[PDB]
Protein backbone atom coordinates (compact mmCIF):
# COMPACT_ATOMS: atom_id res chain seq x y z
CA UNK A 1 0.00 0.00 0.00
CA UNK A 2 1.78 3.14 -1.28
CA UNK A 3 2.08 6.02 0.62
CA UNK A 4 3.51 9.40 0.18
CA UNK A 5 4.14 12.35 2.38
CA UNK A 6 4.96 15.68 1.98
CA UNK A 7 7.09 17.42 5.02
CA UNK A 8 8.99 21.04 5.37
CA UNK A 9 6.16 23.31 4.42
CA UNK A 10 5.94 26.50 6.02
CA UNK A 11 5.83 30.19 6.00
CA UNK A 12 8.88 31.79 4.56
CA UNK A 13 9.65 35.34 3.33
CA UNK A 14 9.88 36.63 -0.44
CA UNK A 15 13.38 36.28 -1.68
CA UNK A 16 13.65 33.34 0.71
CA UNK A 17 14.40 29.87 0.27
CA UNK A 18 12.67 26.45 1.81
CA UNK A 19 13.04 22.59 1.04
CA UNK A 20 10.37 20.20 0.88
CA UNK A 21 10.75 16.77 1.52
CA UNK A 22 8.76 13.90 0.41
CA UNK A 23 9.19 10.21 1.65
CA UNK A 24 7.51 7.17 -0.04
CA UNK A 25 6.68 3.77 1.15
CA UNK A 26 4.77 0.60 -0.64
CA UNK A 27 6.94 0.50 -3.68
CA UNK A 28 10.06 0.59 -5.13
CA UNK A 29 10.62 4.22 -4.85
CA UNK A 30 14.26 4.00 -7.39
CA UNK A 31 11.64 2.28 -10.23
CA UNK A 32 9.58 5.20 -11.07
CA UNK A 33 9.62 8.98 -12.13
CA UNK A 34 8.52 11.33 -9.64
CA UNK A 35 6.91 15.11 -9.72
CA UNK A 36 6.03 17.79 -7.44
CA UNK A 37 2.42 19.62 -8.67
CA UNK A 38 1.30 22.54 -6.68
CA UNK A 39 -2.63 24.00 -6.50
CA UNK A 40 -3.80 27.16 -5.31
CA UNK A 41 -7.48 28.19 -5.25
CA UNK A 42 -6.84 30.77 -7.78
CA UNK A 43 -5.04 29.16 -10.34
CA UNK A 44 -5.92 25.10 -9.81
CA UNK A 45 -3.27 22.03 -10.12
CA UNK A 46 0.51 23.13 -11.49
CA UNK A 47 3.21 20.47 -12.67
CA UNK A 48 6.31 22.24 -11.54
CA UNK A 49 9.21 19.61 -11.67
CA UNK A 50 9.91 15.99 -12.74
CA UNK A 51 12.90 13.59 -11.73
CA UNK A 52 13.22 10.22 -13.68
CA UNK A 53 15.76 7.23 -13.05
CA UNK A 54 19.07 6.59 -12.26
CA UNK A 55 19.53 4.98 -15.55
CA UNK A 56 17.87 8.10 -16.94
CA UNK A 57 21.10 9.67 -15.51
CA UNK A 58 18.21 11.22 -13.36
CA UNK A 59 16.88 13.66 -15.79
CA UNK A 60 14.72 16.74 -14.67
CA UNK A 61 11.87 18.45 -16.32
CA UNK A 62 11.11 21.64 -15.21
CA UNK A 63 8.02 24.55 -15.74
CA UNK A 64 9.48 27.48 -17.01
CA UNK A 65 8.25 29.46 -14.49
CA UNK A 66 10.23 28.05 -11.93
CA UNK A 67 13.42 27.12 -13.91
CA UNK A 68 16.64 28.14 -11.97
CA UNK A 69 14.86 28.97 -9.14
CA UNK A 70 13.79 25.16 -7.99
CA UNK A 71 15.48 22.08 -7.80
CA UNK A 72 13.99 18.74 -7.87
CA UNK A 73 16.44 15.79 -6.61
CA UNK A 74 15.80 12.37 -5.38
CA UNK A 75 17.63 10.07 -2.73
CA UNK A 76 16.75 6.58 -4.02
CA UNK A 77 18.66 4.84 -0.68
CA UNK A 78 15.95 6.29 1.29
CA UNK A 79 12.96 6.53 -0.95
CA UNK A 80 12.88 10.06 -0.30
CA UNK A 81 12.23 13.28 -3.03
CA UNK A 82 12.98 16.74 -2.49
CA UNK A 83 11.91 20.01 -3.60
CA UNK A 84 15.29 22.77 -3.14
CA UNK A 85 13.45 26.03 -3.61
CA UNK A 86 15.00 29.47 -3.84
CA UNK A 87 14.08 33.11 -4.43
CA UNK A 88 10.42 32.39 -3.72
CA UNK A 89 8.10 34.95 -4.35
CA UNK A 90 4.40 35.38 -3.23
CA UNK A 91 2.85 33.84 -6.48
CA UNK A 92 4.79 30.72 -5.22
CA UNK A 93 2.43 30.39 -2.40
CA UNK A 94 0.14 27.30 -2.48
CA UNK A 95 -0.16 23.01 -1.52
CA UNK A 96 2.62 21.47 -2.55
CA UNK A 97 2.18 17.43 -3.66
CA UNK A 98 4.55 15.18 -4.56
CA UNK A 99 3.46 12.24 -6.91
CA UNK A 100 5.09 8.46 -8.09
CA UNK A 101 3.40 7.20 -11.38
CA UNK A 102 3.89 5.04 -14.43
CA UNK A 103 2.16 3.85 -16.57
CA UNK A 104 -0.32 1.71 -14.42
CA UNK A 105 -0.99 3.98 -11.59
CA UNK A 106 -0.80 7.32 -9.80
CA UNK A 107 -0.48 8.12 -6.11
CA UNK A 108 -0.23 11.95 -4.53
CA UNK A 109 0.78 12.47 -1.27
CA UNK A 110 -1.60 14.79 0.96
CA UNK A 111 0.17 17.70 0.30
CA UNK A 112 1.77 20.37 2.45
CA UNK A 113 1.39 24.31 2.76
CA UNK A 114 3.78 26.42 1.46
CA UNK A 115 2.93 30.58 2.47
CA UNK A 116 5.39 32.89 0.96
CA UNK A 117 4.63 36.41 2.34
CA UNK A 118 6.23 39.15 4.24
CA UNK A 119 3.57 39.11 6.94
CA UNK A 120 4.64 38.48 10.48
CA UNK A 121 3.42 35.21 12.61
CA UNK A 122 0.50 36.26 14.56
CA UNK A 123 -1.64 34.55 17.39
CA UNK A 124 -4.88 34.67 16.70
CA UNK A 125 -7.81 35.70 19.53
CA UNK A 126 -10.24 33.11 20.29
CA UNK A 127 -14.14 34.25 21.07
CA UNK A 128 -17.28 32.18 22.21
CA UNK A 129 -20.26 32.87 20.61
CA UNK A 130 -23.35 32.25 22.64
CA UNK A 131 -27.36 33.01 21.83
CA UNK A 132 -29.20 35.52 23.40
CA UNK A 133 -32.57 34.10 23.66
CA UNK A 134 -31.07 31.20 23.29
CA UNK A 135 -31.86 27.68 21.44
CA UNK A 136 -32.52 25.85 24.17
CA UNK A 137 -35.84 26.16 23.84
CA UNK A 138 -36.66 24.49 20.99
CA UNK A 139 -35.06 21.35 21.15
CA UNK A 140 -31.88 22.08 19.86
CA UNK A 141 -29.48 25.10 19.71
CA UNK A 142 -26.30 26.38 17.98
CA UNK A 143 -23.32 27.66 19.35
CA UNK A 144 -19.88 29.29 18.16
CA UNK A 145 -16.40 29.49 17.73
CA UNK A 146 -14.40 32.90 16.83
CA UNK A 147 -10.98 32.73 16.05
CA UNK A 148 -9.97 36.31 14.94
CA UNK A 149 -6.24 37.65 13.34
CA UNK A 150 -3.89 34.89 12.70
CA UNK A 151 -0.93 34.43 10.75
CA UNK A 152 -0.10 31.96 8.82
CA UNK A 153 -2.93 29.74 7.67
CA UNK A 154 -3.20 26.56 9.64
CA UNK A 155 -5.46 26.39 12.73
CA UNK A 156 -7.05 23.45 13.96
CA UNK A 157 -10.42 23.82 15.85
CA UNK A 158 -12.39 20.78 17.60
CA UNK A 159 -15.66 20.71 20.22
CA UNK A 160 -15.41 18.53 23.31
CA UNK A 161 -11.79 17.38 22.01
CA UNK A 162 -13.24 16.31 18.59
CA UNK A 163 -16.04 14.25 20.86
CA UNK A 164 -18.37 16.17 19.12
CA UNK A 165 -18.22 15.69 15.64
CA UNK A 166 -21.45 16.07 14.08
CA UNK A 167 -23.56 18.78 13.68
CA UNK A 168 -20.40 20.70 13.67
CA UNK A 169 -19.57 23.05 10.26
CA UNK A 170 -16.32 24.60 10.50
CA UNK A 171 -16.14 27.70 7.99
CA UNK A 172 -13.02 28.33 5.86
CA UNK A 173 -10.52 30.79 6.77
CA UNK A 174 -10.58 34.21 4.92
CA UNK A 175 -7.45 36.64 5.17
CA UNK A 176 -8.05 40.08 4.91
CA UNK A 177 -4.61 42.92 5.61
CA UNK A 178 -2.20 39.86 5.93
CA UNK A 179 -4.23 38.54 9.05
CA UNK A 180 -6.92 35.47 9.11
CA UNK A 181 -10.72 35.03 10.67
CA UNK A 182 -12.16 31.57 10.68
CA UNK A 183 -15.49 30.52 12.46
CA UNK A 184 -17.36 27.62 13.36
CA UNK A 185 -20.70 26.40 14.60
CA UNK A 186 -21.85 23.25 16.69
CA UNK A 187 -25.49 22.59 16.60
CA UNK A 188 -26.77 20.23 19.97
CA UNK A 189 -29.83 19.48 21.36
CA UNK A 190 -31.56 22.17 24.11
CA UNK A 191 -31.51 19.60 26.58
CA UNK A 192 -27.73 19.36 26.12
CA UNK A 193 -25.86 22.85 27.10
CA UNK A 194 -25.67 24.88 28.75
CA UNK A 195 -25.92 22.07 31.78
CA UNK A 196 -23.15 19.87 30.09
CA UNK A 197 -20.11 21.83 29.08
CA UNK A 198 -19.31 22.62 25.19
CA UNK A 199 -15.73 23.61 24.47
CA UNK A 200 -14.26 25.19 21.52
CA UNK A 201 -10.33 23.99 21.17
CA UNK A 202 -8.49 25.92 19.28
CA UNK A 203 -4.72 26.00 18.16
CA UNK A 204 -2.90 27.45 15.85
CA UNK A 205 0.71 25.80 15.67
CA UNK A 206 2.85 28.44 14.22
CA UNK A 207 2.36 30.67 17.12
CA UNK A 208 2.58 27.53 19.32
CA UNK A 209 -1.47 28.66 20.67
CA UNK A 210 -3.74 26.27 22.37
CA UNK A 211 -7.03 27.35 23.78
CA UNK A 212 -10.01 26.12 25.40
CA UNK A 213 -12.88 28.01 25.13
CA UNK A 214 -15.53 27.21 27.31
CA UNK A 215 -19.28 28.64 25.68
CA UNK A 216 -20.52 30.40 28.49
CA UNK A 217 -24.65 30.86 28.67
CA UNK A 218 -26.03 34.44 28.83
CA UNK B 1 1.83 24.03 -22.99
CA UNK B 2 -0.62 21.30 -23.65
CA UNK B 3 -4.11 22.65 -23.12
CA UNK B 4 -6.49 20.81 -21.17
CA UNK B 5 -10.54 22.10 -21.16
CA UNK B 6 -13.31 20.73 -19.60
CA UNK B 7 -17.01 21.21 -19.04
CA UNK B 8 -19.00 21.68 -17.42
CA UNK B 9 -17.46 23.85 -14.42
CA UNK B 10 -20.45 22.90 -12.61
CA UNK B 11 -22.46 19.77 -12.72
CA UNK B 12 -25.76 19.22 -10.80
CA UNK B 13 -27.21 15.63 -10.57
CA UNK B 14 -29.68 13.79 -9.04
CA UNK B 15 -28.95 10.17 -6.85
CA UNK B 16 -28.87 7.44 -9.55
CA UNK B 17 -28.92 9.72 -12.10
CA UNK B 18 -26.07 10.01 -14.97
CA UNK B 19 -22.79 12.31 -15.04
CA UNK B 20 -21.21 13.24 -18.19
CA UNK B 21 -18.16 15.21 -17.82
CA UNK B 22 -16.17 16.52 -20.72
CA UNK B 23 -12.40 16.95 -21.31
CA UNK B 24 -10.44 18.08 -24.43
CA UNK B 25 -6.78 18.86 -25.39
CA UNK B 26 -5.01 20.93 -27.63
CA UNK B 27 -3.31 18.26 -29.43
CA UNK B 28 -2.70 14.28 -29.70
CA UNK B 29 -1.88 12.52 -26.44
CA UNK B 30 -0.81 9.15 -28.18
CA UNK B 31 2.26 8.50 -26.65
CA UNK B 32 2.58 5.12 -28.40
CA UNK B 33 -0.07 2.38 -29.70
CA UNK B 34 -2.08 1.32 -26.55
CA UNK B 35 -0.62 4.26 -24.76
CA UNK B 36 -2.35 7.61 -24.62
CA UNK B 37 -1.85 8.87 -20.97
CA UNK B 38 -5.03 10.69 -19.97
CA UNK B 39 -6.31 10.19 -16.09
CA UNK B 40 -8.82 10.91 -14.36
CA UNK B 41 -8.77 11.88 -10.55
CA UNK B 42 -11.39 13.01 -7.81
CA UNK B 43 -10.64 15.35 -5.49
CA UNK B 44 -12.60 15.77 -2.29
CA UNK B 45 -13.06 18.78 -0.08
CA UNK B 46 -10.37 19.20 2.14
CA UNK B 47 -8.36 16.01 -0.03
CA UNK B 48 -5.62 14.68 -2.43
CA UNK B 49 -6.41 14.06 -5.94
CA UNK B 50 -7.57 10.21 -6.35
CA UNK B 51 -6.92 8.38 -9.65
CA UNK B 52 -10.22 7.08 -11.23
CA UNK B 53 -9.38 6.33 -14.60
CA UNK B 54 -6.06 6.04 -16.05
CA UNK B 55 -4.95 5.68 -19.92
CA UNK B 56 -8.37 6.81 -20.95
CA UNK B 57 -10.82 3.99 -19.68
CA UNK B 58 -8.87 1.58 -17.37
CA UNK B 59 -10.56 1.80 -14.03
CA UNK B 60 -8.20 2.27 -11.05
CA UNK B 61 -7.87 0.05 -7.77
CA UNK B 62 -11.26 -0.13 -5.61
CA UNK B 63 -13.09 2.37 -8.27
CA UNK B 64 -16.61 0.54 -9.23
CA UNK B 65 -17.78 -0.06 -12.85
CA UNK B 66 -20.25 2.83 -12.42
CA UNK B 67 -17.25 5.27 -13.75
CA UNK B 68 -16.43 4.59 -17.51
CA UNK B 69 -13.96 6.31 -18.97
CA UNK B 70 -13.55 7.16 -23.04
CA UNK B 71 -12.48 9.30 -25.65
CA UNK B 72 -9.38 9.54 -28.21
CA UNK B 73 -8.29 12.21 -30.70
CA UNK B 74 -8.35 15.24 -28.43
CA UNK B 75 -11.81 14.41 -27.23
CA UNK B 76 -12.23 12.34 -23.85
CA UNK B 77 -15.03 11.89 -21.42
CA UNK B 78 -16.00 10.62 -17.70
CA UNK B 79 -18.71 9.19 -17.45
CA UNK B 80 -20.85 7.97 -13.63
CA UNK B 81 -23.34 5.69 -13.58
CA UNK B 82 -25.89 5.82 -10.73
CA UNK B 83 -24.17 8.65 -8.96
CA UNK B 84 -23.87 8.37 -5.09
CA UNK B 85 -23.39 10.38 -2.28
CA UNK B 86 -19.75 10.15 -2.05
CA UNK B 87 -19.41 11.13 -5.41
CA UNK B 88 -19.15 14.84 -4.56
CA UNK B 89 -16.29 16.74 -5.11
CA UNK B 90 -14.04 18.12 -8.20
CA UNK B 91 -12.98 16.16 -10.86
CA UNK B 92 -10.23 16.70 -12.76
CA UNK B 93 -8.55 15.25 -16.31
CA UNK B 94 -4.38 15.40 -17.06
CA UNK B 95 -2.51 14.06 -19.60
CA UNK B 96 0.78 12.39 -19.03
CA UNK B 97 1.64 12.64 -22.33
CA UNK B 98 3.86 16.11 -23.36
CA UNK B 99 6.09 18.10 -20.49
CA UNK B 100 4.83 19.61 -19.44
CA UNK B 101 2.28 18.36 -17.36
CA UNK B 102 -1.28 19.76 -17.64
CA UNK B 103 -4.04 19.39 -16.04
CA UNK B 104 -8.05 20.31 -17.04
CA UNK B 105 -9.63 23.48 -14.54
CA UNK B 106 -11.91 20.95 -13.02
CA UNK B 107 -15.36 20.30 -13.07
CA UNK B 108 -16.79 20.05 -9.65
CA UNK B 109 -19.88 17.75 -8.65
CA UNK B 110 -23.41 18.60 -7.30
CA UNK B 111 -25.89 16.73 -5.60
CA UNK B 112 -29.06 17.55 -5.97
CA UNK B 113 -31.87 17.52 -3.47
CA UNK B 114 -34.76 19.25 -2.11
CA UNK B 115 -34.58 23.14 -1.43
CA UNK B 116 -33.89 23.95 2.07
CA UNK B 117 -34.17 27.21 3.92
CA UNK B 118 -31.18 27.95 6.45
CA UNK B 119 -31.00 27.84 9.67
CA UNK B 120 -30.04 31.71 10.91
CA UNK B 121 -28.62 32.15 14.42
CA UNK B 122 -26.78 35.46 15.44
CA UNK B 123 -24.41 36.23 18.32
CA UNK B 124 -23.43 39.73 19.84
CA UNK B 125 -19.89 39.97 20.78
CA UNK B 126 -18.46 38.40 23.68
CA UNK B 127 -17.31 40.15 26.66
CA UNK B 128 -13.57 38.96 25.51
CA UNK B 129 -13.87 40.69 22.71
CA UNK B 130 -15.61 43.67 24.12
CA UNK B 131 -13.27 44.00 26.87
CA UNK B 132 -10.28 44.64 24.36
CA UNK B 133 -12.47 47.28 22.75
CA UNK B 134 -14.06 45.11 19.82
CA UNK B 135 -17.19 44.21 18.66
CA UNK B 136 -17.79 41.53 16.19
CA UNK B 137 -21.82 40.30 15.48
CA UNK B 138 -21.88 36.97 13.93
CA UNK B 139 -24.55 35.09 11.82
CA UNK B 140 -24.62 31.65 10.89
CA UNK B 141 -27.37 30.34 7.77
CA UNK B 142 -26.80 26.47 7.86
CA UNK B 143 -27.64 23.59 6.11
CA UNK B 144 -29.43 25.28 3.11
CA UNK B 145 -30.07 24.19 -0.87
CA UNK B 146 -29.50 25.28 -2.85
CA UNK B 147 -25.88 27.40 -2.39
CA UNK B 148 -27.20 30.62 -3.76
CA UNK B 149 -27.66 33.32 -1.09
CA UNK B 150 -27.49 36.88 -0.17
CA UNK B 151 -26.83 38.23 3.32
CA UNK B 152 -27.25 41.21 4.74
CA UNK B 153 -26.91 43.36 7.94
CA UNK B 154 -28.99 46.01 9.22
CA UNK B 155 -27.98 47.96 12.32
CA UNK B 156 -31.16 50.03 14.03
CA UNK B 157 -32.83 49.13 10.98
CA UNK B 158 -30.88 51.41 8.37
CA UNK B 159 -28.64 48.66 6.05
CA UNK B 160 -24.98 48.65 7.22
CA UNK B 161 -22.46 46.62 5.96
CA UNK B 162 -19.09 47.76 6.47
CA UNK B 163 -16.40 45.41 8.47
CA UNK B 164 -17.82 42.42 7.01
CA UNK B 165 -16.51 39.12 6.53
CA UNK B 166 -18.30 36.23 4.48
CA UNK B 167 -17.04 32.76 4.10
CA UNK B 168 -19.10 29.36 2.82
CA UNK B 169 -18.63 25.88 3.15
CA UNK B 170 -18.66 22.90 0.67
CA UNK B 171 -21.53 20.81 0.08
CA UNK B 172 -22.12 18.52 2.72
CA UNK B 173 -21.29 15.21 1.99
CA UNK B 174 -24.27 13.31 4.15
CA UNK B 175 -26.91 15.99 3.75
CA UNK B 176 -25.78 17.66 0.54
CA UNK B 177 -26.40 21.14 1.99
CA UNK B 178 -24.42 24.19 2.07
CA UNK B 179 -23.60 26.37 5.28
CA UNK B 180 -22.90 30.15 5.64
CA UNK B 181 -20.82 32.01 7.89
CA UNK B 182 -20.98 36.07 7.77
CA UNK B 183 -19.00 38.58 10.71
CA UNK B 184 -19.47 41.76 11.24
CA UNK B 185 -16.88 43.63 12.60
CA UNK B 186 -17.65 47.10 14.88
CA UNK B 187 -15.19 48.80 17.14
CA UNK B 188 -16.89 48.35 20.65
CA UNK B 189 -17.51 52.20 20.11
CA UNK B 190 -19.29 51.68 17.39
CA UNK B 191 -20.95 49.06 18.70
CA UNK B 192 -22.52 50.66 21.47
CA UNK B 193 -24.06 53.89 19.31
CA UNK B 194 -26.87 51.56 18.21
CA UNK B 195 -29.31 48.75 19.53
CA UNK B 196 -30.61 46.56 17.00
CA UNK B 197 -28.73 44.37 15.02
CA UNK B 198 -30.05 42.23 12.34
CA UNK B 199 -28.90 39.33 9.99
CA UNK B 200 -30.92 39.34 6.86
CA UNK B 201 -31.11 36.35 4.42
CA UNK B 202 -32.59 36.34 0.96
CA UNK B 203 -32.92 32.89 -0.30
CA UNK B 204 -35.12 31.41 -2.67
CA UNK B 205 -37.13 29.16 0.00
CA UNK B 206 -38.69 32.13 0.82
CA UNK B 207 -40.13 35.11 -0.33
CA UNK B 208 -39.69 37.20 2.29
CA UNK B 209 -35.76 37.52 3.71
CA UNK B 210 -35.56 35.32 6.60
CA UNK B 211 -33.74 37.18 9.27
CA UNK B 212 -32.80 36.74 13.15
CA UNK B 213 -31.83 39.40 15.17
CA UNK B 214 -31.30 41.06 18.90
CA UNK B 215 -31.18 44.34 21.00
CA UNK B 216 -28.11 45.16 23.15
Known amino acids: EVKLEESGGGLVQPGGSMKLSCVVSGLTFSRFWMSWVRQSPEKGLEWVAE??????????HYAESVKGKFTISRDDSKSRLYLQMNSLRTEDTGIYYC?????????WGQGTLVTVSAAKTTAPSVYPLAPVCGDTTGSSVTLGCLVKGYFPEPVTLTWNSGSLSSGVHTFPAVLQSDLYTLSSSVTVTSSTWPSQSITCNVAHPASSTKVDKKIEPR | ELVMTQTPLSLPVSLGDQASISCRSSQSLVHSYGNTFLNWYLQKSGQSPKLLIY???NRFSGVPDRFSGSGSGTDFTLKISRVEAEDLGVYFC?????????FGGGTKLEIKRADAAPTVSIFPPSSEQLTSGGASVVCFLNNFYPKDINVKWKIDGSERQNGVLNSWTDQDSKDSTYSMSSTLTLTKDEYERHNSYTCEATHKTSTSPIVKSFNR
Open chain 1, 51 to 60: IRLKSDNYAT
Open chain 2, 55 to 57: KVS
Open chain 2, 94 to 102: SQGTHVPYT
Open chain 1, 99 to 107: KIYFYSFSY
